[PDB]
Structure 1
């Protein structure tokens, strides 16, 4: 159970895993009517599959994560269809006062007419007003599913994500990359760390031969 904190209140937590590097090896070797051999040959096979684009053996390694993220990050995340999701419902749950407030450092490198600290304050102010309106509508008898429509996109949500290593590697190619929004790159970095810990050979081979993004080769 590895847990990595992301942003001001979010996290990525490993809930469960099926298999390891040898799961991909065993699945690849069935093609030749073979099974496992030895650490050197098996690790060499992992590198071979990654170098030649033999991706299907990696589908037999599966992960389950527990993620707490702002809704704008979850909307980008939930576009990855080759995976399983189960999320907190704003129709049935009374939502908590938990929102992503960017730190002033998030606006570094941008020439802004107002200080980054003031942008942080303006964002906090609007979430405070929206959350107060939400509670007022709830207390006045407005059904939850309608009252929440005033809540901003930085509202924190929670979800379970079940994904295989092949789809997870596609997620890393697209999200652990400077073109993805900074907030989701941070989440992808945490996914990469858990992946590296559970599948060191696959992760190392992935970075070496198949990884298409840019930030995982620069950030340890």
Structure 2
């Protein structure tokens, strides 16, 4: 399961633990009970979601593999209730891969410069920066220093392990028009995968708990 994002980004599902019934099981222990049947168990998921009983959803866990620009990753990595491992500019020579916005990204803004020219100006500056980076590397400057000239639109890659409760918090905050458009796009892909693996939890989340605006439209 892999969804392409932006010009060179992606969100890929690496692994998952549990499913909707993992949450049902965890909730039912309060009452000294276990699973029942489809109708009552699905009903329980809705009940939990509607009354803010969120801890049972911590027992569903995902691992994603994400390729995203650094400015997006910086926003994403603010979610502390999660696990991350990322590509290092200290330890790796970084690839020529940068997020160049499409002209349509500037739709809705009156600019004194054509959108195509904005695109071009972003490209020029990344090209120069990357060339400088390689030059510094070639001349013996350690990578950890050479990379400081690279722009925030450089692509990075990381593993993200997150449980369904924290993932819902992420969707609330990132699948939302107040978040930057670029991370909205990533959050939509996260939502798609979530919905696929946990359809009852996802549906109940949208119906009762989701606070953002865009998932109910798309």
TM class by shorter-chain length?
A: over 0.9
User: How far does residue 26 in structure 1 lie from its aligned partner after superposition?
Assistant: 0.1
Deviations 1:115-146 (A, max 9, x none): 00000000000000000000000000000000
TM-score (ref. length: structure 2): 1.00
User: How far does residue 175 in structure 1 lie from its aligned partner after superposition?
Assistant: 0.1
Separation in 2, partners of 1:15, 1:109 = 36
User: How far does residue 159 in structure 1 lie from its aligned partner after superposition?
Assistant: 0.0
Residue 216 of structure 1 pairs with residue 215 of structure 2: yes
Separation in 1, partners of 2:159, 2:46 = 30
User: How far does residue 34 in structure 1 lie from its aligned partner after superposition?
Assistant: 0.1
Secondary structure at 1:118 match in 2: helix
Q: Residue in 2 aligned with 1:144?
A: 143
Separation in 1, partners of 2:124, 2:205 = 43
User: How far does residue 84 in structure 1 lie from its aligned partner after superposition?
Assistant: 0.1
Separation in 1, partners of 2:52, 2:91 = 44
User: How far does residue 67 in structure 1 lie from its aligned partner after superposition?
Assistant: 0.1
User: How far does residue 52 in structure 1 lie from its aligned partner after superposition?
Assistant: 0.1
User: How far does residue 105 in structure 1 lie from its aligned partner after superposition?
Assistant: 0.2
Q: Residue in 1 aligned with 2:24?
A: 25
User: How far does residue 106 in structure 1 lie from its aligned partner after superposition?
Assistant: 0.1
Secondary structure at 1:178 match in 2: coil
For structure 2, list consecutive stretches of 5 or more residues without a partner in the other structure.
Answer: none
Secondary structure at 1:113 match in 2: coil
Separation in 2, partners of 1:92, 1:30 = 47
Coordinate RMSD, CA, aligned: 0.2
Deviations 1:47-101 (A, max 9, x none): 0000000000000000000000000000000000000000000001000000000
For structure 1, list consecutive stretches of 5 or more residues without a partner in the other structure.
Answer: none
TM-score (ref. length: structure 1): 0.99
Separation in 2, partners of 1:116, 1:149 = 28
Separation in 2, partners of 1:122, 1:35 = 60
Separation in 2, partners of 1:184, 1:57 = 27
Q: Which runs of 4+ in 1 moved over 4 A?
A: none
Separation in 2, partners of 1:47, 1:176 = 21
Secondary structure at 1:74 match in 2: helix
Alignment size in residue pairs: 218
User: How far does residue 187 in structure 1 lie from its aligned partner after superposition?
Assistant: 0.1
